[PDB]
Design a protein around this ligand. Structure first.
Ligand SMILES: Nc1ncnc2c1ncn2[C@@H]1O[C@H](COP(=O)(O)OP(=O)(O)OP(=O)(O)O)[C@@H](O)[C@H]1O
Lengths: 144, 267, 91, 78, 109, 108, 106, 93
């Protein structure tokens, strides 16, 4: 009886820090809903070179990572984006199929294609170009 | 009044699921025999360098072969007179001199003496008795010194034909057959939001939140340390709080109404 | 010929604004100040030498205050000191 | 409880060492109270030194310093 | 009895298997295993984290209930008078740990 | 040079953090003294001064006087459990004693 | 040249050098004068000798060659000047002086 | 580890005053404590004397005065005598 831990509020207080970080745990950053709204509504319409900021990026917002398999996580993000976006946007939030294992399968399917063959770094390229050499692929980071 | 706990049912209790070991040592050599049978250019070893679980396998399959934490541990026994060093899941979490390859709280590798032995365990348990290409994951906007040190360990220590770095969430995007969207990926170290426009990541404006599953575990440990205030007779590890979070936490839909009437007696 | 008079006066006119204090009483209060100073400083020095440190940090002063002053006195003193050091750091 | 481990016989012996011929039955509980107050004072200081030193173990030196602080200097330890 | 455990310790080992592919010419450098502060000091990317500016709903930090008012002595958000009682008689050294769990402890230096 | 802000103020204090620092440093308590130490010690000295002077003014009002004197300081230092424990082996000049007559000596 | 200890130069068994170091490194003063450790070593040696002499006598009286804590207690409490110097001091395994108050005897 | 003590010198003095007598480890601990305690007392009082009279040096004269304040009666006279002998031998050599 003494060796028992009861959980009441910790069920809904701990996975809530993703949405209200500055109040529950004091991390002085923004919530997930507010970051998604900042990107969808204030940066992407102001970026030249793309056609439709709400009509394209809202077609597929899906959730990938391991810290996602909580009950009712996509619905919270959908209600937040529904509160932020204009009325009539075809919002459809879904998730990946194998959330903790698709990060491996995507690089498994990518590994032996022509873009990957055009993005490798061989040994003599490491001997010549140096150490911090970046083949600019559309998935990797920015070249330097 | 005896009513509020007279007809109350007996409790349904759940035990502790601590991340222990598991009784398996496979020296799997049946993958190299299939890898040497394929034509060249279509054989590569893919390593997901995850902060919670480094995964590794061959590209022509669907499940990864090795899925281990970056835990290693080295010892010296004077009662036996021998130096031990095993790594991965073979550590039991009875002895623990555990240090991790990832820095606690950030998915940037800065403990290279651990990462070298982790990669050593990977290449041993895959089977290397002798030169395949390597596709390896990293974090978003990685520091250049970490990439330099990782490339130096790949070329100089082991000897590899080629390696290429990529972002694992974007690989899971490309496997999920998307073209243009908003990838939100909550990892073990940080939660990234990355806009992708026609199979191209717009990394000039992606934003990472500094919260993750490790922060879930540590904050859960702090709240169970401060809830049970007068002293709890029990070892409060971080990993058992992580397994509490994995199966006893859910994001509530309407938080400010659910929260204020949560600790009522009725129910 | 330096004395904590000035400061005793400023504190007095903060806590009982229209009340004065006599010259003899000022002497006694100054002696009080010197005595408490000495005791705390000395206990702090001892704690330092005992822990093989060569510096009297805020943490030495805190522990000295907790050893010297009784009960509520100790608690309130710790509080005030902590508040002061915090404000100093902020500025 | 544990204070009642300071038994009536133990207190008798200490009174005998001090030259006491006859002991009223009320002395035993008074002695326990007096002892508890003394130990609390010394242990409070000993723990205070222990905490300062960033230790979890109370040492002989912490007790010796606590006793010297209170004017009851102990020779034989340290 | 402990022979099975000893065999499990012996077979789970890296030095028991010879490294048939490690290059012995390579030598490790000492100046590794740094921190993020040190690596950022070397290069003076990863500054795309963004703060917020919005009203925050302040909850309790003893319990998880919504709490509307704090204290002068200890600066703790608290729900009602039971939690106020447990705040004003808690043993010392923990009233700072609640602000440590919430953040902005500001420990002395 | 930028304007000289007194440390007492930088601290929100009436007491002289400056002098306290001199006395700790020039006073051989140790080889090195932090800034924190002066600040904290000055604060603690102010607090106890405040308590004593407050109780003393309370006593002075109780006796309808405007001026704190030694007897007042003494009666203050003796009516508080905590100050009397802090100053239990201190003699205050011109302080006198607290009024006390045993029961057995009182008229019966 | 050959080293001559300040102890031997002063005619003392007690360590003048060690005492000098302890006076410097114990934060007692900014400066420690050359005569100070010699004087302090002389005094500590004297008082050491005085207690050990009386303790040796106490040991002899109990027909033992080893000074045990009991002998230090008997040595200290039977000399008025030691008992005034060490009045507030407790000695482990020292015991008490044999002393029954006059009115308790039959 | 390393833990220096006065046990050596205590033993040297013992074998001058009573050659046939020995000393137990517990008694040696007490003697080690005693030397430390009276060192701290005399050095401490000499420190105060120096500070009071606005002097920065614990000279022989401070130690002498400290000894007169701390030791009772004949112990003061004898201690002051041996100290005066010691500094005389030292300075004359
Ligand atoms: N069934 C589940 N329910 C909830 N959470 C889970 C479940 N299974 C795993 N998790 C969480 O997923 C996390 C592991 O995520 P994962 O290992 O994919 O991140 P990662 O890819 O290593 O991160 P990074 O890319 O930063 O290295 C763990 O914190 C665990 O809490």
């Amino acid at each position: 009886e003494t060796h028992r831990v009861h959980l009441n509020v910790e069920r809904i207080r701990v996975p809530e820090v993703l949405f209200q970080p500055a109040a529950i745990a004091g991390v002085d950053q923004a919530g997930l809903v507010e970051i998604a709204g900042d990107i969808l509504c204030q940066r992407l319409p102001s970026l030249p070179g793309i056609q439709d900021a709400p009509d394209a990026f809202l077609r597929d917002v899906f959730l990938t990572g391991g810290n996602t398999l909580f009950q009712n996580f996509d619905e919270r993000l959908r209600q937040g984006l529904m509160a932020l976006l204009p009325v009539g946007a075809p919002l459809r939030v879904r998730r990946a199929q194998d959330a903790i294992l698709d990060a491996w399968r995507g690089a498994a399917g990518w590994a032996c294609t022509e873009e990957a063959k055009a993005a490798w770094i061989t040994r003599e390229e490491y001997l010549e170009k140096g150490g911090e050499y970046i083949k600019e692929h559309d998935l990797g980071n920015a070249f330097a | 009044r005896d009513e509020p706990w007279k007809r109350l049912p007996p409790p349904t209790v759940y035990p502790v699921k601590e991340a222990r070991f598991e009784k398996y040592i496979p020296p799997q050599l049946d993958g190299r025999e299939r890898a040497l049978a394929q034509p060249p250019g279509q054989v590569a070893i893919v390593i997901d360098n995850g902060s919670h679980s480094v995964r590794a396998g061959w590209n022509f399959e669907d499940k990864p072969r090795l899925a281990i934490p970056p835990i290693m541990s080295k010892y010296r026994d004077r009662k036996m007179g021998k130096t031990f060093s095993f790594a991965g899941s073979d550590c039991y979490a009875a002895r623990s001199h555990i240090r991790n390859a990832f820095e606690a709280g950030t998915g940037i590798v800065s403990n290279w003496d651990v990462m070298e032995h982790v990669l050593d365990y990977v290449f041993v348990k895959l089977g290397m008795n002798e030169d395949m290409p390597i596709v390896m994951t990293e974090a978003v906007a990685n520091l250049p010194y970490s990439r330099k040190s990782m490339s130096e360990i790949i070329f100089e220590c082991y000897g590899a034909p080629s390696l290429v770095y990529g972002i694992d969430s974007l690989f899971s995007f490309r496997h999920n057959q998307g073209q243009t969207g908003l990838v939100v990926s909550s990892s073990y170290s940080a939660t990234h939001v990355i806009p992708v426009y026609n199979r191209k990541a717009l990394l000039s404006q992606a934003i990472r939140l500094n919260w993750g599953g490790w922060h879930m575990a540590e904050y859960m440990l702090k709240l169970l340390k401060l809830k049970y205030y007068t002293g709890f007779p029990g070892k409060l590890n971080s990993s058992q709080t992580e397994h509490m979070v994995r199966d006893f936490c859910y994001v509530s839909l309407d938080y400010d109404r659910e929260l204020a009437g949560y600790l009522d007696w009725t129910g | 010929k330096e004395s904590y008079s000035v400061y005793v006066y400023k504190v007095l006119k903060q806590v009982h604004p229209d009340t004065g204090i006599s010259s003899k009483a000022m002497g006694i209060m100054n002696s009080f100040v010197n005595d408490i100073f000495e005791r705390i400083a000395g206990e702090a020095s001892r704690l330092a030498h005992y822990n093989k440190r060569s510096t009297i940090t805020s943490r030495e002063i805190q522990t000295a205050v907790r050893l010297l002053l009784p009960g509520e006195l100790a608690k309130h003193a710790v509080s005030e000191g902590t508040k002061a050091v915090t404000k100093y750091t902020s500025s | 409880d544990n204070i009642q481990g300071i038994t009536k016989p133990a207190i008798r012996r200490l009174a005998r060492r001090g030259g006491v011929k006859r002991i009223s039955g009320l002395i035993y509980e008074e002695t326990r109270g007096v002892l508890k107050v003394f130990l609390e004072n010394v242990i409070r200081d000993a723990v205070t030194y222990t905490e300062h030193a960033k230790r979890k173990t109370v040492t002989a030196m912490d007790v010796v310093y606590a006793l010297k602080r209170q004017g009851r200097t102990l020779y034989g330890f340290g | 009895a402990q022979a099975a455990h000893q065999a499990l310790v012996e077979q789970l080992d890296l030095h028991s298997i010879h490294k048939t592919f490690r290059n012995p010419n390579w030598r490790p450098n000492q100046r590794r295993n740094k921190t993020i502060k040190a690596i950022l000091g070397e290069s003076q990317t990863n500054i795309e984290s963004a703060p917020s500016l919005a009203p925050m709903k302040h909850y309790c930090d003893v319990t998880g209930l919504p709490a509307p008012y704090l204290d002068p002595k200890t600066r703790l958000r608290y729900h009602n008078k039971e939690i106020f009682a447990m705040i004003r008689n808690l043993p010392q050294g923990m009233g700072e740990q609640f602000l440590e769990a919430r953040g902005a402890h500001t420990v002395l230096k | 040079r930028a304007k000289a802000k007194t440390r007492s103020s930088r601290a929100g204090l009436q007491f002289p953090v400056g002098r306290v620092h001199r006395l700790l440093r020039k006073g051989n308590y140790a080889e090195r003294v932090g800034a924190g130490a002066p600040v904290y010690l000055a604060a603690v000295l102010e607090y106890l001064t405040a308590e004593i002077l407050e109780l003393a003014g309370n006593a002075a009002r109780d006796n309808k006087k405007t001026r704190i004197i030694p007897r007042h300081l003494q009666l203050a230092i003796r009516n508080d459990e905590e100050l009397n424990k802090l100053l239990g082996k201190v003699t205050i000049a011109q302080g006198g004693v607290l009024p006390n007559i045993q029961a057995v000596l009182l008229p019966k």
